[PDB]
């Protein structure tokens, strides 16, 4: 049977609320009621996948929370976050944050213990700045890609294949812009972050002089034939069978269309928004070399939408990919959620009654092909205050729990960065899939679903 277990308790969060909401911080029996929590749904939150740090930023002020194991009355060293750092991150005037990210970094020392080197904090601002801090708060790197506000940040890490057929995708970090796509190679980040941290640490003691800031990889795609874009997902690199190649060529052309004898690899992105509702972008990989203070860097390649689902009145607002990268879940403003097969560009199942819902995914492996893995979709309706566990595609509602109306469902979608094949199977520490943070209990819980229920 499905069950949700508590795993962390906040030591004090009212302090973070008071720091980020100064105005929030005895009566003759006046009726004081209608007390609810909306500041968590207003803030930018991020919790590291390995449970090492917490970022909570409101407008231009970001509190960093650090764990601390305390022996209770019974001797248990229960996990309790405690504010580690709290300050303003605005360097310019009118600059406000638009997103946050906590990426653990794998150790190159072959450390068998579960100690990643550090959890870098990647923040994006309205002015067009991407800034990288350490856990303490020290500023490491600041980069301006485009003058337009930073919309979303999505990091792609390493995942071991489920079966021989499963392929591997490059480590990547992508930045969504109103009408542009910016991608940064994860290897460049791994080779710049460490360096910057080493220089700062050496500067702290050895007194290392300031170092000319090295530029990063930077490929700006110019999006097109789109009116409004809200979210995006990086499906990534894919290959086409000769059957598929001929099918798509036939449809795109006609009778007189020709067929090339060398199918090109095309990176796929998906963008929700308005006009159209959903658009599928394909970009030629290897056609344009990646480029290496100025927002006017020349775009790498213009990108036009090949096709999509034309729905003007419809306005998409989110999109999340399944762990297997075969399914996507998109929420619209009509209070409905659709599930798409990315390899075909069609919808499979469309649930109803979910305004401002939040999506998550849980993958369960049959403990013993290698194992009958099974995916489960999570739907959180905040107004009704309910948490639902659906099947990967079709099947009954596996679970339904009543939680607070003011919780938050966090689904990172990545793992420890910088790992490779041999390191992964040799040893790996604990990493979660989704978490539920609650203000009333000031706690962080996890959801566990057995695999057997899938058999039904």
């Amino acid at each position: 049977a499905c069950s949700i277990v508590q795993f962390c308790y906040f030591q004090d969060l009212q302090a973070a609320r008071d720091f980020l909401f100064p105005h929030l911080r005895e009566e003759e029996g006046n009726t004081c009621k209608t007390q609810k929590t909306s500041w968590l749904q207003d803030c930018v939150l991020s919790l590291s996948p390995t449970n090492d740090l917490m970022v909570i930023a409101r407008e231009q002020k970001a509190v960093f929370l650090v764990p601390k194991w305390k022996y209770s009355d019974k001797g248990k060293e229960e996990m309790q976050f405690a504010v580690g750092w709290s300050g303003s991150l605005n360097v310019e005037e009118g600059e406000c944050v638009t997103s946050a990210l906590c990426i653990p970094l794998a150790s190159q020392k072959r450390s068998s213990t579960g100690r990643p080197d550090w959890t870098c904090i990647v923040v994006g601002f309205t002015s067009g700045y991407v800034r990288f801090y350490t856990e303490n708060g020290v500023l490491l790197l600041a980069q301006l890609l485009n003058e337009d506000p930073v919309l979303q940040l999505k990091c792609r890490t390493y995942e071991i294949p489920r079966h021989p057929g499963v392929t591997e995708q490059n480590e990547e970090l992508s930045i969504l812009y109103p009408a542009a796509i910016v991608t940064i190679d994860g290897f460049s980040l791994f080779q710049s972050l460490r360096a910057c941290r080493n220089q700062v640490a050496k500067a702290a003691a050895s007194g290392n002089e300031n170092i000319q800031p090295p530029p990063l990889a930077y490929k700006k795609w110019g999006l097109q034939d789109i009116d409004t874009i809200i979210d995006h997902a990086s499906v990534g690199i894919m290959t086409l069978s000769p059957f598929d190649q001929m099918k798509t060529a036939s449809n795109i052309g006609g009778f007189n269309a020709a067929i090339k004898n060398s199918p090109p690899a095309m990176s796929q992105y998906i963008t929700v928004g308005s006009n159209p509702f959903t658009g599928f972008f394909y970009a030629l990989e290897g056609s344009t070399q990646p480029l290496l203070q100025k927002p006017k860097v020349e775009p790498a390649t213009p990108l036009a939408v090949r096709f999509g689902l034309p729905d003007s009145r419809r306005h998409g607002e989110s999109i999340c990919l399944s762990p297997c990268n075969t399914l996507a879940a998109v929420t619209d403003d009509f209070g409905r959620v659709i599930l798409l097969d990315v390899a075909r560009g069609i919808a499979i199942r469309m649930w109803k009654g979910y305004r401002d819902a939040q999506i998550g995914w849980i993958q369960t492996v049959e403990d013993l092909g290698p194992s009958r893995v099974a995916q489960f979709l999570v739907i959180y309706a905040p107004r009704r205050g309910i948490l639902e566990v659906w099947s990967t595609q079709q099947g009954p509602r596996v679970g339904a729990f009543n939680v607070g109306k003011h919780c938050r469902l966090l689904y990172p979608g990545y793992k420890i960065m910088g790992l490779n094949n041999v390191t992964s199977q040799s040893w790996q520490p604990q990493t979660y899939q989704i978490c539920l943070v609650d203000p009333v209990s000031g706690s962080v819980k996890t959801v566990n679903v057995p695999f057997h229920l899938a058999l039904s």
Binding site: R162, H163, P164, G165, S241, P242, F243, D244, M246, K247, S250, N251, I252, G254, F255, N256, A257, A258, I259, N261, P276, R306, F307, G308, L309, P310, D311, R313, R314, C324, T326, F334, R336, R344, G345, I346, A347, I348, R349, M350, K352, E366, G369, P370, S371, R372, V373, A374, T392, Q393, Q394, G395, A454
Partner: protein, 464 residues
């Protein structure tokens, strides 16, 4: 809600629920030639969500289901009926059938097409919207009958469709092109395409069963008061010869850009289809026509004289029917031209039939033989092609009946087949090794200007 897309979806649910296609089905395996000897019923209906008008056409084969006491007995493992029927081999290449029945070997199928004409879905977004609506429809209602959607034009005849079952999806897809790289004209390229689309990680695979069929077309044939009867031009137009390999296996022979074993003489079964030349100007369906009572009876006896040796044994009954039909109208005041036209059509049909019979016997020389038991075999082989457009040949090309066909082709080994049809089938656990084993099927037809592949590929929705 009920927005335009949802309205379309709801309308499709209605069109499918009214026909009672919802639920599981269980019948009997189809015997040989059911597709031909049987008949096919159809039901239409109209739907339009915002502006575009669509015609919903359901086609189905008559099934004399005898036992009904069965309370829809269901097993834990129930793969859809159409899924199993994808692998049928008794009814390969039906002489006449719908394109989808010939291609996918199906028995019951709905089609959503542009209503009337002058309407064609061209852009990819609209086709994908239609297919999404179809997929949601089948997911919601629970219907397992395959659904199809017409795309591109009408003359190109492109369809895309889906079939759904518990834990199983089947995608009917089709490519139709004119020119391809020369590595796709043999069986090896087709097998490579088949196994590349399968894409199963379990690289060790059983051989794919292959059904081969060739089509040859031959047009050249080398060498008082008496009513004038006879047909000036040849009433026949072309002779079609189809050679059929019913069941082979991968690796038993080879077929590539160098070495091929597809010899028509070795085909264990030989079938013949004939073509009727249009406007076979005759001399007796026009001579009397030029005067349109006395000339109404002339043909009655004239026709009888020529068929006294032929003994078609249809005119007699048709003449008796004409006699009865005229019994009361032959005198009605001011006789109308309707009868004149009816008897004209009867006379011209009979004379054309007897002309074609004579032409067929003359082409195959039934009397141009000394062996009474063979010349008779030849006469019974002839005249049978006049009714149905498909007859078997005794002993394939080896037999004397087929030997003549062989000699005409030689006098014209065999001219390049104007059409080759291949059918590939396999049962593999796609798309992951821990998933169910499902049947993938692929049909291909190659001509000089046409290249069509129609594939039904299955996948596991539960554990992919």
């Amino acid at each position: 809600t009920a927005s335009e897309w949802e309205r379309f979806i709801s309308k499709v649910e209605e069109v499918l629920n009214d026909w009672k296609l919802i639920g599981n089905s269980l019948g009997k395996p189809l015997e040989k030639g059911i597709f031909t000897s049987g008949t096919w019923e159809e039901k239409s209906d109209e739907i339009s969500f915002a502006d575009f008008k669509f015609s919903v056409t359901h086609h189905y084969l008559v099934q004399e289901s005898t036992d009904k006491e069965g309370k829809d007995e269901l097993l834990e493992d129930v793969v859809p009926q159409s899924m199993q029927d994808l692998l049928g081999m008794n009814n390969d290449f039906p002489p006449r059938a719908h394109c989808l029945v010939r291609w996918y070997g199906l028995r019951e199928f709905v089609v959503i097409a542009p209503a009337a004409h002058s309407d064609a879905v061209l852009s990819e977004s609209k086709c994908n919207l239609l297919l999404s609506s179809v997929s949601i429809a089948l997911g919601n209602t629970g219907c397992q009958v395959p659904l199809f959607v017409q795309i591109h034009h009408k003359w190109r005849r492109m369809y895309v469709g889906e079939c759904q079952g518990p834990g199983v999806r089947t995608d009917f897809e089709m490519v139709h092109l004119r020119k391809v790289p020369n590595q796709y004209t043999h069986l090896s390229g087709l097998l490579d395409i088949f196994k590349s689309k399968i894409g199963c990680p379990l690289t060790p695979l059983p051989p794919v069963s292959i059904a081969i069929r060739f089509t040859y077309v031959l047009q050249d044939w080398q060498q008082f008061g008496k009513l004038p009867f006879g047909a000036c031009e040849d009433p026949i137009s072309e002779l079609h010869l189809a050679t059929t390999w019913p069941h082979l296996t991968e690796g038993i022979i080879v077929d590539n850009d160098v070495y091929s074993d597809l010899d028509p003489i070795q085909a264990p079964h030989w079938s013949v289809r004939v073509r009727k030349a249009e406007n076979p100007q005759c001399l007796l369906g026009d001579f009397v026509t030029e005067f349109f009572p006395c000339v109404i009876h002339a043909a009655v006896l004239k026709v009888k004289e020529e068929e006294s040796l032929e003994n078609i044994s249809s005119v007699k009954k048709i003449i008796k029917q004409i006699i009865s039909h005229s019994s009361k109208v032959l005198h009605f005041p001011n006789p109308e031209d309707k009868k004149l036209e009816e008897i004209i059509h009867q006379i011209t049909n009979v004379e054309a039939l007897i002309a074609r019979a004579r032409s067929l016997k003359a082409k195959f020389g039934t009397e141009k033989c000394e062996q009474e038991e063979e010349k008779e075999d030849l006469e019974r082989f002839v005249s049978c092609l006049l009714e149905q457009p498909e007859v078997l040949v005794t002993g394939a090309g080896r037999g004397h009946a087929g030997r003549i066909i062989h000699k005409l082709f030689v006098n014209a080994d065999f001219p390049p087949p104007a059409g080759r049809e291949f059918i590939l089938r396999t049962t593999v656990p796609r798309p992951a090794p821990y998933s169910k084993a499902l049947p993938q099927r692929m049909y291909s037809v190659l001509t000089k200007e046409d290249f069509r592949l129609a594939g039904a590929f299955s996948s596991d929705t539960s554990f992919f």
